[PDB]
């Protein structure tokens, strides 16, 4: 478990210039030339040494979830009517009883049932 | 000078395809750090001085109040035995 | 310590399996000295395989090695060159799938060219690949510090 | 021409520092 | 509340701000079972709301 | 053979806030290897070769 | 030690101070903040506040940044602001010139709630038309340069001379004293805290049993900051029309 | 890096999994947990779970401890449990003998909801009467020794050989793999994770865009754990009658 440490020390740093191994190599290579006859501080000498395609997930599911909020964008046919129950009141009742899915998901569910019930290509009478 | 020798050292170590150009780039970075080092020293010394002076004033501010309360107690207790 | 050059090819990247490949690489005692996700051009992909300019399947490959982003990795372990190839397994995906059913290429490869990985084969080639992709990592200044070859390299530099 | 061997000494010193750090990490593991 | 005296005009506009303003429970008028009310501009902090036959202040 | 000379030199020179620069670096490396920290290169100056002001 | 304020904890702790958001806007934020943070390339993005308007469409304002650096004795955060009126779609809140900053500073009253409106000012009679988003951005700038509260010694300087979280921060020793907090733009180790501010412009209420301190701005009534000491979290929020309280000397 | 799980974040993240509490009980907890934590002298005290009963008065169970130490290769937490049926007044949940542990393990069904009830068992015909709180404690002990999930390398050993939070923890590299999580009672650096558990007793769903992983126990359906990687928080909760799922081989 010594080559493990030596390998770990050479893990190159994208932010900084080089690895920790190279940092220590440069520090020691300076000190051997510096030769502090009296003393030297590690912090200050290491500071003097140092001073001398993106990877993001896809937003498809999250944007599909956020699209149920507000009103769609128009580049509009009339939304069909539908009957339903008071869903925000349902979230409130369930939360008061201690069951269900909470009240943030209650809002999301109500908006999703709205996006379903108000769909022309899907002539719905009632959503639940 | 030392610049030329250390630049040739780097050109042999890192082994660039274009030695002269990388050499010049390293020369420029080095001559910048040549001033940056002294600037670092200046900054550190000045900050330490600021710290020490703040603490000096904090000490004197309490010395004053010590002496004042002491003088008050002096007079108050002196009156007792007259 | 041995450093080898690895590669995660666009078929594994598109399938959403580069993270699994790296996690298995590190489960097998390796240590990723460096990782990068780039997009190789045409001329640079040529010069990378520049020793196969006369090979028949060369365009079939070079058009695949530009079909998307790749993951370039620098691995390190005691005896890393050959252990990495023992991990990647045989080059023929079907041969590998027959012999080592739990190999890397036998799990993330589909074709004789869509094998999902590319290790080095010789330390010379590994060093050349790494110097091609990561020209910043200094490789053995000890060996290249020959007291005689340095004067010749000075003649080169002048 | 005197720059050559000065650079040679610099590179030798670099190798020296490398080996020093090697021994240092070897000792750190045992520590 | 339509008849309450407006606030004096502030620099930047000539129209006196109203004494009350609306507050909405949704960003789309189409949402079902919305609740709504008014908030005071003279006493910032006071509100009244009503959903059905159920109101509060 | 210069390795032993350099080692004696480093075990000779004393730290400003300690002694035997060699041993200071050795303790630093042992601490870094004990728990490989987040951004080890940056943690060198902010957690091991120093101490943050409100640490305890 | 937290790495970034959590909007859930902020809305939970500062709800007693009346700093609340609608339920729909709460859900919409929970979805929209990560999207904008990623597609802007920012390391941090949080809800800064909520400014009330005359037509009921309050402006939600979010603030983000990538890295903070020490320049000229100040910890400068290259911040970028966004606004919204529903909590789902964030638009840019562009900076304003210095000359226009004075004019928008002269405009008072509650904002209209119509981003296309522009107010009028008269000078020597040259009339200027100032867009409403300009007024919004300057009110946000004023409130930000006034408060921007963090705990003391919660940040630290690194080798590249950048201001980073102090991950070994142990907490404020005396959470009920103004010395425990500071402005964001004060360098670590500079000794400048909120006690150096004008005496009487901050109030602190500390619940010593639960360990939650609340710091309220009296100069900008509507800015609330909370610090929980048993879990080592903190965070602030502005809620209100954005106008400064100039009568403070008569109200204390 | 958090120092202790936050009940607000737990209830927020695990609400989609149906792990919810009543509103009154939520407020009552917000008041009652600090009181009991202080008057018991404990450093940590959190909501462990909620067991459903036949009469509608579910048992809320809280777990606290002071310090965890490494003994015999295990990270032992000297935990103490409390129960409640309203969320306001916590009573002790006393340990049970080993002999009675078997008997209460033999008792099945949903609990009654009457702390004064006692069930009956028959053996060779010697009848035993087992109090209901004994059954409750045994079910809690079983669920606890089965799950007790934390992230891997989130704890660390200190000089006194005690298990303390690793304040330099950077996060799980691969949050969607079971290797990122471990049992609480596994020593730091021991390499034992949840992947060493019986294959198929854990499920992991990871939302790679928001960075929230959910780990569900399939052996004890009702135990949920969450890990948020952008804010570095985590926490677990049990909600259900407390019985183990023995038909697991037929359900996978």
From TrEMBL, chain C:
Tell me which residues bind ATP: 9, 57, 85, 91, 105, 115
Positions of the catalytic residues? 118 (pros-phosphohistidine intermediate)
Subcellular location, record wording: Cell projection, Cilium
Q: Which residues form the Nucleoside diphosphate kinase-like domain?
A: 1-141
Top-level taxon: Eukaryota
Family indicated by similarity: Belongs to the NDK family.
Name under which the protein is recorded: Nucleoside diphosphate kinase 6
The record lists the organism as Chlamydomonas reinhardtii
In terms of the parent sequence, the fragment covers 4 to 161 of 586
From TrEMBL, chains G, H:
Q: Which UniProt keywords apply?
A: Cell projection, Cilium, Cilium biogenesis/degradation, Cytoplasm, Cytoskeleton, Flagellum
Compartment list: Cell projection, Kinocilium; Cytoplasm, Cytoskeleton, Flagellum axoneme
Q: Which family does it belong to?
A: Belongs to the flagellar radial spoke RSP9 family.
UniProt main location, coarse: other
Q: Which GO terms describe its cellular component?
A: axoneme
Give the matching InterPro entries.
RSP9
Composition bias (Basic and acidic residues) maps to 117-124
Name of the protein = Radial spoke head protein 9 homolog
Q: What superkingdom does the record give? A: Eukaryota
Q: Which GO terms describe its biological process?
A: axoneme assembly; cilium movement involved in cell motility; motile cilium assembly
Disulfide bridge map = 104-138
């Amino acid at each position: 478990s010594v080559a493990q440490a030596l390998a770990y020390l050479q893990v190159h740093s994208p932010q900084d210039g080089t690895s920790m191994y190279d940092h220590l190599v440069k520090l020691v290579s300076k000190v051997l030339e510096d030769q502090p006859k009296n003393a030297v501080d590690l912090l200050e000498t290491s500071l003097l040494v140092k001073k001398s395609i993106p990877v993001a997930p896809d937003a498809t599911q999250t944007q599909a979830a956020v699209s149920i909020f507000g009103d769609p964008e128009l580049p509009a046919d009339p939304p069909n009517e539908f009957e339903a129950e008071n869903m925000l009141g349902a979230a409130a009742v369930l939360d008061c009883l201690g069951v269900g899915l909470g009240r943030e998901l209650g809002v999301n569910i109500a908006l999703a049932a709205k996006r379903i019930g108000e769909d022309p290509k899907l002539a719905v009478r009632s959503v639940r | 000078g030392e610049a030329l020798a250390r630049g040739c050292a780097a050109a042999i170590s890192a082994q660039p395809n274009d030695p002269v150009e990388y050499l010049g780039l390293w020369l420029l970075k080095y001559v910048k750090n040549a001033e940056v080092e002294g600037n670092f020293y200046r900054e550190r010394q000045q900050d330490l001085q600021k710290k020490k002076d703040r603490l000096v004033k904090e000490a004197q501010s309490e010395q004053a109040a010590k002496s004042v309360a002491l003088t008050r107690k002096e007079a108050a207790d002196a009156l007792a035995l007259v | 310590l041995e450093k080898t050059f690895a590669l995660i090819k666009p078929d594994a990247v598109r399938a959403g399996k580069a993270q699994e490949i790296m996690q298995l690489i590190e489960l097998n005692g390796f240590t990723i000295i460096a990782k990068q996700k780039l997009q190789l051009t045409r001329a640079r992909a040529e010069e990378f395989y520049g020793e196969h300019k006369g090979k028949e399947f060369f365009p079939k490959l070079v058009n695949f090695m530009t079909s998307g982003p790749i993951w370039a990795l620098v691995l390190a372990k005691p005896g890393a060159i050959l252990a990495w190839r023992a991990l990647m397994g045989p080059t023929n995906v079907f041969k590998a799938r027959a012999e080592q059913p739990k190999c890397l290429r036998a799990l993330y490869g589909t074709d004789g060219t869509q094998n999902a990985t590319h290790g080095s084969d010789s330390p010379i080639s590994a060093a050349r690949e790494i110097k091609f992709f990561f020209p910043t990592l200094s490789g053995d200044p000890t060996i290249y510090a020959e007291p005689t070859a340095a004067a010749e390299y000075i003649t080169k530099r002048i | 021409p005197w720059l050559k061997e000065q650079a040679i000494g610099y590179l030798a010193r670099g190798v020296v520092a490398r080996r020093v750090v090697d021994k240092l990490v070897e000792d750190a593991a045992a520590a | 509340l339509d008849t309450d005296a407006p606030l004096p005009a502030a620099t930047g506009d000539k129209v006196p701000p109203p004494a009350w303003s609306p507050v909405f429970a949704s960003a789309s008028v189409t949402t079902r079972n919305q609740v709504a009310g008014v908030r005071s501009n003279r006493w910032p902090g006071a509100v009244c709301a009503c959903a059905g036959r159920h109101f509060t202040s | 053979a210069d390795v032993g000379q350099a080692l004696a030199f480093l075990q000779q020179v004393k730290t400003t806030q300690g002694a035997s620069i060699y041993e200071g670096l050795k303790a630093a490396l042992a601490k870094v290897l004990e728990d490989r920290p987040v951004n080890a290169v940056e943690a060198l100056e902010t957690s091991v070769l120093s101490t943050p002001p409100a640490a305890n | 030690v937290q790495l970034e304020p959590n909007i859930t904890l902020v809305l939970k702790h500062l709800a007693s101070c009346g700093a609340v958001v609608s339920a729909e806007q709460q859900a919409a934020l929970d979805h929209s903040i990560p999207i904008k943070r990623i597609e802007a390339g920012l390391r941090s993005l949080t809800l800064w506040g909520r400014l009330t308007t005359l037509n009921g469409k309050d402006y939600l304002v979010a603030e983000g940044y990538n890295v903070a650096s020490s320049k000229e004795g100040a910890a400068v955060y290259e911040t970028k602001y966004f606004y919204s009126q529903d909590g789902a779609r964030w638009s840019d809140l562009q900076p304003v010139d210095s000359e226009t900053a004075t004019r928008c500073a002269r405009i008072k009253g509650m904002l209209s709630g119509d981003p296309a409106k522009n107010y009028e000012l008269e000078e020597k009679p040259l009339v200027f038309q100032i867009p409403e988003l300009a007024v919004l951005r300057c009110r946000v700038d004023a409130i930000a340069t006034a408060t921007s509260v963090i705990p003391t010694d919660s940040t630290i300087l690194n080798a590249a001379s950048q201001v980073v979280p102090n991950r070994l921060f142990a907490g404020a020793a005396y959470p009920e004293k103004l010395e425990s907090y500071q402005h964001r733009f004060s360098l670590p180790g500079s000794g400048v805290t909120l006690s150096q501010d004008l005496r009487g412009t901050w109030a602190v209420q500390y619940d010593a049993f639960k360990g939650v301190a609340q710091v309220r701005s009296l100069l900008f009534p509507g800015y609330f900051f909370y610090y929980a000491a048993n879990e080592l979290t903190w965070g602030s929020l502005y809620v209100g029309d954005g106008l400064r309280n100039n009568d403070l000397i008569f109200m204390l």
